[PDB]
Write a protein that binds this ligand. Structure first.
Ligand SMILES: *[C@@H]1O[C@H](CO)[C@@H](O[C@@H]2O[C@H](CO)[C@@H](O)[C@H](O)[C@H]2NC(C)=O)[C@H](O)[C@H]1NC(C)=O
Ligand SMILES: *[C@@H]1O[C@H](CO)[C@@H](O[C@@H]2O[C@H](CO)[C@@H](O)[C@H](O)[C@H]2NC(C)=O)[C@H](O)[C@H]1NC(C)=O
Ligand SMILES: *[C@@H]1O[C@H](CO)[C@@H](O[C@@H]2O[C@H](CO)[C@@H](O)[C@H](O)[C@H]2NC(C)=O)[C@H](O)[C@H]1NC(C)=O
Lengths: 464, 216, 218
């Protein structure tokens, strides 16, 4: 028998009125979305796996017979097991909701499963979910084009964001450059979407810098007072500041995102991930993968888990969709891989918490911590042999002479279990005032299992 | 889209209290302060105070401390302002305005017109104004909105689709009732061949009336 | 309390020219590198719209002809080139300390070419006559300058009583003014006369613009 390749062509039997298309492609993976009037044509393939090609149409093609709203067609070498499955699953996705925002929630949760546990099933499912979300939007938008014009930015930016994260989990450098091409950049931008738009189109950061700085500053002031902040607007502000912040902006930003990523906030991000990845997850409450990534995966708290992939995904997500590729690593290159938590200093230095003490460096071993889960605090400045422990001291003055002594200091709480609970930057005299009083974090409320440190732009003291 | 929804009108007697509402959507309700702003007819803007919907923290303008109480309902995404011992000095448009993180007011409600008065609500009479019998390249049609109380009314032409060539005249108060009018100018080929309808909403009486302009 | 003083109270400019609006604060509104200064535009029947935040930053979707500058106590809003839709009132505002306050407002008006009013007269609607009332409506539309006089005549006699006038703010597209004049009579008074006239006198013509109808002969 002569060795030959067997190639089949399948032609969709109606012409498609094409509205949008996008493709991301490298040797490892391919992902294409084609949108037409009442048409989705989607092709996804991972190297060494069978391609998946799916069509969703509002119309049913004439079938030869013996004498929901949409129709799903699957092209490929699926045996009955995967063929019956794929057809039923893809139809269940498209008919789940006529609301494009609920479809987008499901697309975010499916992309989250793919970043956390990369593999062919989660990659193909998340590619399908993104395509169906864009299709349901396109179908609603088709009807009233003037009313839909403000909602285009959210879908377009998420298509760029989700495709980038999915293509990297598949081993490719880039997601879609654009889906709804030329359309989104022409639409007026609402104030609530300014930071998202600056990220989506890679706009000159200069007119949005004060806005980004104020977003970060205010998010932090709220966090420390126990108030919720806009974590999505925070994500886009951080993205702008790490790409084109003035001197010391990137450093000030990462101190604040670290401070906002409390141990409690980190556990909330892990609980939210679990709830989003649940097979019984419902989209009555909207979900964005930015709700898990911001503040924690854009912070210098590295430790929490079965979701270390989140940090790397968020650092990738931070690059605009219009030197080190990682803007977090770019802002503070001195921070090592073994750092549980870092607090950036002036002069290319940072405080660094680790389990094991550094070699040839000044370090403090922290008192009152379990021997199996220890805490070493070191300063990483670009050889010391001495065994250091932090000096026990009380807080003087307590006088308010319009001079801030504890300004630029970090108040740190740690447990006997060896977890850094809180990391409070004292940025104002107002905060310094609350530190002496009896906000919430620095006044006493918790028992004799929690210790506290004052970290200076020099050395370390144990309070009280 | 960020939306702040305020009822158009409140009619309240002198000496009574009022509660005005601002329903927020399209953003995380507990992540932003809500301001209230007072504007009296043909006068400037006065900032009343702000409330944080997350924990009910308030800041008040000291001029309003005895007059005003801000509250929130998280479950309905609603901010309220309550005013006590109402006088005619309190009659004004009351705006809610979201505080941006830059500390300016980035989104605004349409405003509630508060009328402090012992007079009753009166729905308007809406009259179509068609041209005289006997004709150039363009046609002016009108809509007369007579004898309503309190302010405001909202007038549209063809449910808002006919917006150019429109003049809507401010209301005039005559013997305790308001009268407003509107004109619309179209080409002679457009009317009466295509339908022109005046729509008038009076929020205080919850009335919405349509009058088609028919030739005399 | 911080008092904000705007100057001028009113500005009239031709299309294409530079509008400069000043805001002076009684105390500094600048702290730690930021000025807590904001500018808003307001058109009648609409809420104010934020133009400029933190003294110098253009809000999203605001045209580049708008700019703000200043620090401490002295602040400026610039509009260059001015366009028709810029006819509005402009307010400065501070968020430096309690109470937050606004400036007194600056009304910007556009200077343009003279334009004769278009005059239209409307007899009472048949619906109104059924109710016992009779309003006669006269529109004087799209004129410039705003100075105008209107006269009603009933069977060639001037009528002053029962006349109510209303004026639009300057038009956002063509910078003209409009006026409604409404003569309110009883159905009985209305039916006692034949000839109804609205006369507009405006500087664009030596002769008034006269619109009339006869109650009888349609
Ligand atoms: C995504 O896939 C579609 C469908 O295969 C591509 O559009 C086709 O491109 C071929 C050339 O490869 C044309 O000759 C066909 O006319 C196209 N069909 C339709 C329905 O548009 C599209 O090029 C892909 N997008 C990207 C960005 O590569
Ligand atoms: C830098 O290091 C010194 C180490 O002693 C810090 O301690 C202060 O030292 C001065 C010395 O006269 C005392 O008056 C203060 O009371 C000390 N403060 C505390 C809290 O112990 C000093 O704070 C560090 N400086 C900065 C700017 O970080
Ligand atoms: C913040 O304000 C609200 C309302 O003023 C408080 O919650 C309750 O309000 C509901 C309806 O608005 C009533 O049914 C309850 O009786 C209130 N319950 C209690 C226990 O007060 C709310 O508690 C306030 N929360 C904080 C943290 O200040």
């Amino acid at each position: 028998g002569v060795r030959r390749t067997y190639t089949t062509a399948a032609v969709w039997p109606a012409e498609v009125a094409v509205l949008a298309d996008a493709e991301a492609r490298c040797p490892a993976a391919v992902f294409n979305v084609t949108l037409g009037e009442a048409f989705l044509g989607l092709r996804v393939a991972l190297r060494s796996f069978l391609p998946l090609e799916v069509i969703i149409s509002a119309e049913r093609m004439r079938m030869i017979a013996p004498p929901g709203r949409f129709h799903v067609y699957t092209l490929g070498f699926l045996s009955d097991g995967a063929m019956h499955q794929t057809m039923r699953d893809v139809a269940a996705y498209v008919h789940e909701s006529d609301d494009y925002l609920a479809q987008l929630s499901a697309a975010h949760a499916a992309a989250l499963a793919a970043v956390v546990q990369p593999g062919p099933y989660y990659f193909y499912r998340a590619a399908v979910r993104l395509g169906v979300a864009a299709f349901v939007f396109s179908e609603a938008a088709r009807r009233d084009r003037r009313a839909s014009a403000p909602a285009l930015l959210r879908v377009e930016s998420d298509a760029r964001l989700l495709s980038r994260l999915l293509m990297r989990a598949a081993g490719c450098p880039a997601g879609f450059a654009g889906l709804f091409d030329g359309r989104a950049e022409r639409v007026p931008v609402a104030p609530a979407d300014q930071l998202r738009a600056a990220w989506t189109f890679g706009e000159d950061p200069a007119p949005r810098l004060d806005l980004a700085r104020a977003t970060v500053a205010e998010a932090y002031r709220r966090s420390v007072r126990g108030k919720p902040f806009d974590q999505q607007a925070l994500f886009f502000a951080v993205a702008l500041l790490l790409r084109a912040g003035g001197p010391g902006d990137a450093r000030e930003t990462l101190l604040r995102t670290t401070a906002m990523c409390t141990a409690e906030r980190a556990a909330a991000a892990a609980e939210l991930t679990r709830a989003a990845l649940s097979p019984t997850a419902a989209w009555n409450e909207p979900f964005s993968l930015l709700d898990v990534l911001s503040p924690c995966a854009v912070s210098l708290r590295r430790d929490l888990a079965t979701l270390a992939n989140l940090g790397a995904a968020a650092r990738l997500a931070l690059a605009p969709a219009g030197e080190e590729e990682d803007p977090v690593a770019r802002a503070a290159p001195e921070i090592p891989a073994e750092a549980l938590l870092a607090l950036p200093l002036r002069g290319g230095a940072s405080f660094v918490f680790t389990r094991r003490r550094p070699d040839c460096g000044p370090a403090y071993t922290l008192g009152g911590v379990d021997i199996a889960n220890p805490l070493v605090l070191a300063i990483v400045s670009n050889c010391d042999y001495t065994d250091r422990m932090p000096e026990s001291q009380h807080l003087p003055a307590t006088d308010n002479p319009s001079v801030c002594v504890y300004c630029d200091c970090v108040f740190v709480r740690y447990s006997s279990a060896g977890t850094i609970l809180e990391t409070v930057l004292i940025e104002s005299k107002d905060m310094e005032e609350q530190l002496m009083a009896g906000p919430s974090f620095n006044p006493t409320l918790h028992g004799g299992d929690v210790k506290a440190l004052m970290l200076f732009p020099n050395g370390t003291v144990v309070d009280l | 889209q960020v939306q702040l929804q305020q009822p158009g009108a409140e009619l309240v007697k002198p000496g009574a209290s009022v509660k005005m509402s601002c329903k927020a959507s399209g953003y995380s309700f507990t992540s932003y302060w809500m301001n209230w702003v007072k504007q009296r007819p043909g006068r400037g803007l006065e900032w009343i105070g702000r409330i944080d919907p997350s924990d009910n923290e308030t800041h008040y303008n000291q001029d309003f401390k005895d007059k005003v109480t801000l509250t929130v309902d998280k479950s309905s995404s609603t901010v309220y302002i309550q005013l006590s011992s109402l006088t005619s000095e309190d009659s004004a448009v009351y705006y809610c305005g979201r505080l941006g993180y830059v500390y300016g007011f980035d989104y605004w409600g349409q405003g509630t017109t508060l009328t402090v008065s012992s007079a009753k609500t009166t729905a308007p009479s809406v009259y179509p104004l068609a041209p005289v019998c006997g004709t150039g390249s363009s046609v002016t049609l009108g809509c007369l909105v007579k004898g309503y109380f309190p302010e405001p009314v909202t007038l549209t032409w063809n449910s808002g689709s006919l917006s150019s060539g429109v003049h809507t005249f401010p209301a005039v108060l005559q013997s305790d009732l308001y009268t407003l009018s509107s004109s619309v100018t179209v080409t002679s080929s457009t009317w009466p061949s295509q339908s022109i309808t005046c729509n008038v909403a009076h929020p205080a009486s919850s009335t919405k009336v349509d009058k088609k302009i028919e030739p005399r | 309390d911080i008092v904000l003083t705007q100057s001028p109270a009113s500005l009239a400019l031709s299309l294409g020219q530079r509008a400069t609006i000043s805001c002076r604060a009684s105390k500094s509104v600048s702290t730690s590198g930021y000025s807590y200064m904001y500018w808003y535009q307001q058109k009648p029947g609409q809420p104010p719209k934020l133009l400029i935040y933190l003294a110098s930053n253009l809000e999203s979707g605001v045209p580049a002809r708008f700019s703000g500058s200043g620090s401490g106590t002295d602040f400026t809003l610039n509009i260059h080139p001015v366009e028709e839709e810029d006819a509005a009132t402009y307010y400065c505002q501070h968020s430096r300390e309690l109470p937050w306050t606004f400036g007194g407002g600056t009304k910007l008006e556009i200077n343009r070419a003279d334009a004769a009013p278009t005059v239209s007269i409307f007899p009472p609607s048949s619906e109104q006559l059924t109710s016992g009332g009779a309003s006669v409506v006269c529109f004087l539309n799209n004129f410039y300058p705003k100075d105008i006089n209107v006269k009603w005549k009933i069977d060639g006699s001037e009528r002053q009583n029962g006349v109510l006038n209303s004026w639009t703010d300057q038009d956002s597209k063509d910078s003209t003014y409009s006026m409604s004049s409404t003569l309110t009579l009883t159905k009985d008074e209305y039916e006692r006369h034949n000839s109804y006239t609205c006369e507009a006198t405006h500087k664009t013509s030596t002769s008034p613009i006269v619109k009339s109808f006869n109650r009888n002969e349609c």
